[PDB]
Ligand binder design. Structure first.
Ligand code: 6NA
Length: 402
């Protein structure tokens, strides 16, 4: 970080054509949002951030008197110091990493996992040219392995050759007493694979289900793998690799996919109908948004910035970008027309998720044998997350521990 005291601020990184800058101004004026980033308060708490410390972090960010790229956007304090998003979140990470040295075992481990998450959030949404975020992502990764090393649970980092690079994946096991059923898990384009420790700790592990995390192409450890129309590519290779991994029962493999991670799992559940025993997706952009250019052009700048990054765009034309993403729809690709899959897929999203409509999940569910879509209604978002996850583990319990 010392080399990055004056690093270029996140919201200013992505270059847009002047006609596209004019569209961004329209969007910003119409939505009037107080933050550049889409704030995921409830998601981050669900993942393990303490609500009180998160508010303290967000308050120091929003209260700052330091100069912002755009004063409308509270999280755009420029440079690595008080008020900066990366700076303030990394501070919380370092505080966990401090408490970790004065704990041992089952607390030290958990403190480091907490730290990892804070560092990941510090880098969110992980724009590729973001110097502060790159460093945050390094800390996120080193903290995860240090937590893993301290845990009573077993976490192995695998490197699986594929196309002259290696796919980096994390295998979480309760033990190695016998080969265990396993779920391959991927989150969306602005998460890191290390952001799902509680999925394993609080849910999968209680059933001795191993968790194997993977980054989608262009994301995290898979940054060097271009996001193409065959975006399930890396998961298929990781699936084919499970035969050589004796710690897992390759006859009992499932898939969990959040956001765009969900598209890849569905894709895979049509491609490998014998090897995949169960699939569950939450909040996946199956078709609707991808196929709506007019909706893509009206998205907050943070989403367009993430898209430009993952697609390796140097300079962005929004109209062109919006037209290009249609190819990512699983309907446009032909997976949702006639062919059924033997894989039972449970497909959920929260009520009124504009990224994942019930209609999207209904499509998927129909083309799955013993499949099922759900529109999760709840009073709070946390309750929706928790219901969804309870339904997920039951599905995996029923189909994987069969
Ligand atoms: C805006 C929809 C595209 C991104 C979905 C994701 O976060 O994975």
């Amino acid at each position: 970080f010392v080399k990055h005291k004056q690093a270029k601020e996140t919201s200013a990184l992505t270059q847009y054509m002047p006609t596209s800058q004019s569209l961004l101004d329209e969007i910003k004026e119409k939505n009037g949002f107080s933050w550049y980033r889409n704030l995921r308060r409830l998601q981050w708490v669900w993942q393990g951030v303490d609500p009180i410390e998160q508010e303290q972090v967000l308050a120091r960010i929003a209260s700052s008197k330091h100069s912002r790229t755009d004063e409308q956007w509270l999280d755009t304090v420029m440079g690595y110091h008080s008020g900066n998003w990366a700076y303030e979140w990394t501070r919380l990470g370092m505080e966990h990493q401090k408490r970790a040295g004065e704990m041992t075992n089952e607390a030290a481990s958990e403190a480091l996992f907490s730290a990892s998450l804070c560092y990941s959030i510090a880098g969110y949404p992980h724009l590729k040219s973001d110097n502060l975020a790159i460093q945050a992502q390094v800390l996120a990764n080193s903290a995860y392995l240090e937590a893993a090393k301290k845990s009573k649970y077993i976490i192995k980092q695998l490197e699986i050759p594929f196309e002259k690079g290696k796919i980096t994946a994390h295998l979480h096991l309760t033990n190695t007493d016998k080969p265990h059923p396993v779920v391959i898990v991927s989150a969306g384009l602005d998460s890191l694979q290390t952001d799902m420790w509680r999925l394993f700790r609080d849910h999968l592990a209680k059933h001795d289900i191993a968790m194997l995390t993977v980054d989608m192409p262009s994301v995290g450890y898979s940054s060097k793998y271009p996001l193409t129309e065959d975006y399930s590519r890396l998961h298929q290779a990781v699936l084919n690799e499970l035969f050589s991994i004796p710690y897992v029962d390759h006859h009992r493999v499932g898939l969990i996919g959040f956001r765009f991670g969900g598209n890849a799992m569905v894709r895979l559940s049509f491609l490998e109908q014998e090897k995949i025993k169960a699939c569950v997706i939450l909040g996946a952009p199956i078709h609707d948004i991808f196929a709506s250019p007019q909706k893509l052009q009206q998205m907050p700048k943070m989403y367009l910035d993430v898209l430009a990054s993952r697609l390796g765009k140097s300079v962005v034309d929004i109209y062109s970008l919006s037209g290009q993403m249609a190819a990512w729809s699983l309907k446009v690709q032909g997976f949702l027309s006639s062919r059924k899959t033997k894989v039972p897929i449970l497909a959920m999203s929260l009520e009124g998720d504009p990224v994942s409509p019930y209609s999207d999940n209904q499509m998927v569910a129909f083309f799955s044998t013993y499949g099922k879509a759900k529109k999760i209604s709840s009073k709070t978002i946390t309750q929706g997350y928790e219901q969804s996850l309870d339904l997920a583990i039951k599905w995996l319990e029923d189909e994987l521990l069969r």
